[PDB]
Amino acid sequence: GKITLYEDRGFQGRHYECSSDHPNLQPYLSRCNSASVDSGCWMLYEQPNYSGLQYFLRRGDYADHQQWMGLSDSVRSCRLIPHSGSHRIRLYEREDYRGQMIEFTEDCSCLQDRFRFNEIHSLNVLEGSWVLYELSNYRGRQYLLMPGDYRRYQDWGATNARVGSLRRVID
Structure with missing residues (x-):
């Protein structure tokens, strides 16, 4: 780079x-x-x-x-x-990987069209790097996620849990 x-x-x-x-x-x-x-x-x-x-x-x-x-x-x-060559992530409704869960291997321009929560409170990056966005269509605050555990929202640097879209990082 x-x-x-x-x-x-x-x-x-x-x-x-x-x-x-x-x-x-x-x-x-x-x-x-x-x-x-x-x-x-x-x-x-x-x-x-x-x-x-x-x-x-x-x-x-x-x-x-x-x-x-x-x-x-x-x-x-x-x-x-x-x-990364592959990307896989899981998002959770509540802290510590509980409540309803959803997984992505593609970009998601609008989380609420798949999930039914304006907020995401924990998440697991299993593969690849991702940019999480506060708002739908890749707008509002931005947070980089890399492979690893994120057990509360403050672990990705947010001061709130709004999540509205998700993009895979690719070259």
């Missing part, structure tokens, strides 16, 4: 190129207003050490932060999301 991040809008000002996860971009860039993704799938974070608001970016050019749906010019850590 390769991404170039620029301080100024329209691919200007001081820039910095990443090829791996970077937990602290502050020594190399004091703001981020445009980005170019040459390869791979990336997650940008508003705060350092993979903290704060998250934004998914795929191969392409982003002339301003609103183009990746950011609300500010704070990008302070990033992750190169790992490729």
Whole structure:
């Protein structure tokens, strides 16, 4: 993967190129207003050490932060999301993997068309990396999920449990 991040809008000002996860971009860039993704799938974070608001970016050019749906010019850590060949996830109605459950191996643009819960309170990533979204059609807050256990909603970094769509990360 390769991404170039620029301080100024329209691919200007001081820039910095990443090829791996970077937990602290502050020594190399004091703001981020445009980005170019040459390869791979990336997650940008508003705060350092993979903290704060998250934004998914795929191969392409982003002339301003609103183009990746950011609300500010704070990008302070990033992750190169790992490729997978298969994806499988389970979502649960309540904490600790109880209540009604649903599984996906495809993208789901609208969770409520399959499930009947505006909120999801635990989940299991069995394969592949996924971006979870607060709202249907891949809108609202974004949360990266990677293979592993998520037993409450605060484990994917949310402060609420709204989930309305789910996308597989693919290159």
